[PDB]
Amino acid sequence: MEMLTKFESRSSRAKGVAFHPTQPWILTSLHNGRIQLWDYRMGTLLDRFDGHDGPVRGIAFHPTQPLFVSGGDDYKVNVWNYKSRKLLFSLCGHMDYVRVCTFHHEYPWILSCSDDQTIRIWNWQSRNCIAILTGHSHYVMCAAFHPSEDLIVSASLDQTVRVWDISGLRMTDAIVKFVLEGHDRGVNWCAFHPTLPLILSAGDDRLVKLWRMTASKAWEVDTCRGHFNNVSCCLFHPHQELILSASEDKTIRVWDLNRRTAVQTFRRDNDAFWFITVHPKLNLFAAAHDSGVMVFKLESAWS
């Protein structure tokens, strides 16, 4: 395959990117603590947001509200209104770096996870922490809401990927369902497929693992092998039978979903990759690396 680059920012190290679901925008969260709002069709910086000290790793839009959330090495989870351009409030409680923060698509919840070994669920209407999910024994590097079930998946440097049942909180509140074992070093990332009962995880063992889950059990399907440094991030292609991963080996790698064979490697000469994401609807991807962010489409070779 080939990468058709649509937009590139040059900046200090970028840690997170989030696509707006309807506007042609991305937020970027930087190692210097600043958050940029870019229009990738015009190539214009629309706004900058400064509300953190130190790197900002978590960044996400609400799917329908004029809000985004950011999470920092200053332990803060900040909720912003991008229409009024205000920091509405800070959610305090984590006692170490926040690694990821996201909005739920239906409930008024924010999910965050932290080096303090916990996942927190907050209600952004009440501004209260409604659940602290404990059990991991090292940094929690990633957590994600399931798209249609009352589940969370999390990834930790304790070498496990945990699936948590939060049906109780929806209606004790949260119970661990699976403690997925298989990675031989810390796990940095985990993702759900948007429509299939699959999970992807990636870690310092250089492995991307594909897992399948039913209502009552789970199993490792297969492993994508080839990265030669820590894997920072992984995701499912939403509309193609493909897996994508990004790594400190300075590559983004595309893999076949059904065989886990390598399809294509894209390299940068000097930049480690820290994060990749995909637009919910469009064939549009973004990657954050040592020198900034790129927005790109993926096309078959010789198209």
Numbering used by the authors: 1 to 171, 200 to 331
How does the study describe this entry?
Hence, this loss of critical proteins has the potential to compromise ER proteostasis and generate cellular stress. This challenge to normal metabolism is overcome by the activity of the cytosolic coatomer protein I (COPI) polymer, whose repeating unit is the coatomer, a 560 kDa complex of seven distinct gene products (α-, β-, β′-, γ-, δ-, ε-, and ζ-COPI)25–31. Overall, the coatomer functions to retrieve the escaped “client” proteins, such as type I membrane proteins, from cis-Golgi back to ER by retrograde trafficking. In particular, the S protein – a type I membrane protein – is delivered to the ERGIC from both the ER (by anterograde trafficking) and the Golgi (by retrograde trafficking)3,10–12. Here we utilize recombinant SARS-CoV-2 S proteins and tail peptides, including constructs with enhanced mimicry of the coatomer binding motif (clientized S protein), to elucidate the atomic structure of the S-coatomer interface.
The αWD40 Arg300Ala mutation yielded similar dissociation constants (KD) of 3.6 ± 0.4 µM and 4.2 ± 0.4 µM for wild-type and clientized Thr1273Glu S heptapeptides, respectively, and a 1.8 Å resolution crystal structure showed minimal perturbation of the binding site in this β‘WD40 mutant. This suggests that the αWD40 Arg300 side chain is important for the higher affinity for the clientized S heptapeptide. I Superposition of wild-type (white) and Arg300Ala mutant (yellow) crystal structures shows minimal perturbation near the mutation site.
